[model samples]
Target: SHMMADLVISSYGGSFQDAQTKAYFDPYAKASGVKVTGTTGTGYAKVKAMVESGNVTWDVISAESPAFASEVKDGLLEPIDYSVVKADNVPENFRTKYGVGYMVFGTNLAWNKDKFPNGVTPAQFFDPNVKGRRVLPSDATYSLEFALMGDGVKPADLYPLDVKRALKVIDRVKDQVIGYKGASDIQALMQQGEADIVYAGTGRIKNAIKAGANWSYSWEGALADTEYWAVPKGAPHAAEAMKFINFAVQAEPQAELTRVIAYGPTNVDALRLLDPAVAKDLPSYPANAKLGAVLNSKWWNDNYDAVKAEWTTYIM
Candidate 1:
């Protein structure tokens, strides 16, 4: 009927969003007769403003765990109606009362293959024998987590990070760390061979490799983070949002999304249904997923602002 109904999704736009469009929105819209659209950023703050003003517009939103937490703190989310979206195959940890896991990513070390012929590991970043110019992330979580792992804290033992100890480890290698580059900038630094090693997102490095960059990445000591899909408390199309959320959980759609983006699918069955090689590449893969550390979102939820304040000690 071309009735012009839309399900507005709030998420950061880029490659991942494109994958979502193909695997989720395209398929959902094609059959369900709705237009799937995305707005930029997590939209946590925007959702709050909309809810408070009684003019809520967005239907479904994809956001970080803490963004979900923040919105929940501000009473901005509807309790995701499980009757509409059976979250059976999803892990309890992958969801909250307000949101469901949408995608999982890993931040790890990527190195220029030609420069690091012998390869490198988290342990070697500070090794006197493995001295080289290292590019690091300035993001507090990753920087501290990486430092803790390099300081001999095992991946499984990472949380409640000892700041004094992490600082000591990072300070020892400060001279070797030439600069800090973000996930967006690290890919080019690695591909151009301008940096010896970069601590950044796995997909960025994988994209570089697939594009013919002489680079390789490691899962060792990687850290995991997820983005979630949730409905705002008073969204205009909350019913449609619930349908889309359930549609996202289907094994095939989840597989398709993971196939393109390489992020871990929250659907437990999706991994088994995916291409074996591509599934192996996912952060949710048993070998790779287990090798990484996780942050407690609620803990970060309560303490991130304070962490940012303390994070400044490393800037100089």
Candidate 2:
């Protein structure tokens, strides 16, 4: 086949990376004759170091929502080339100068349904009366918003988050807090009955259920987050990276992602292409979305340093 150039991409990896391969990588590689090579598990620190050292290895990276804005602030990413990337179908909220939001997911209150015959509410996540071990992500990106939500902050009133108030709420549940390293920790804890009430990603909770754990999650006050695809500054294949990004965000590919994973797509047209059964479970489903708030990455971008310092102290 004729070729443009090889493109190197990076993401968090695992099943979600498999979905990206099927929906975005393989298809785009076939259509554009651009050989796609992907790697996983690189952190934002690595991304920054790669750019600073001028040894950029990956062309496009699937960046976490909380890290995307900071990457933009640090001049580590290239401005998205709208001329090459058609994003008119993508909502402005999902479009940023340095990155394009490609997926939507949520972190919400989850509990083993077997343990709670009734369901758990968002407020109950913090209630001492709720008799269960509680575990939360150590990262403030996932921690602060939920703390505030459980403390009675409305979704609309979530941004410019009161870190002080949020930390206060965490203090109430601090004794019940058990440590979890990753999504799998939550999944395993729920499945094996080690943790009862967990603040976890919706996908991880669903994974636990699929593995035969009787778990249910409250979308009420869910913390909605997005994952973005960005081209690291001075990428060896910057142009091809933009081309791949443009291809990946089209309705067909975006919808294909939803078919394989429960996460929602960025392009508005993707919803129409999804099977109704699948669409109903997505975090972006209107009824579900209305109950949650998109994380304010811009706010985090400005305050990440201060937030990190506070999180280190609190987690310690």
Best by TM-score: 2
The lDDT of model 1 is 0.77
Candidate 1, superposed: residue stretches over 4 Å from native: 1-6, 43-58, 92-95, 126-138, 172-182, 188-195, 233-236, 284-286, 312-316
lDDT of 1 by residue, 182-293 (tens): 5546776776777887787676777768768888888887888887888888887887788889898777898888787667788888878877887677676789877778
Q: By lDDT, who's the top model here?
A: 2
Per-residue lDDT for 1-316 in model 2, tens only? 2335578898856556777898999999899878898788555777999999999988999987778877888899999998989889999977888999999888878887878989888778778777888889857887888888888899899989999999888888788788744565676788888988888777677767877888888788788888999999989888888889999999999999888777888898988897878777777778988887888887988898899888888888
TM-score of 2: 0.88
Could you estimate the TM-score for every candidate?
A: 0.82, 0.88
lDDT agreement of model 2 with the native: 0.83
Error of 2 at 85 (Å): 1.3
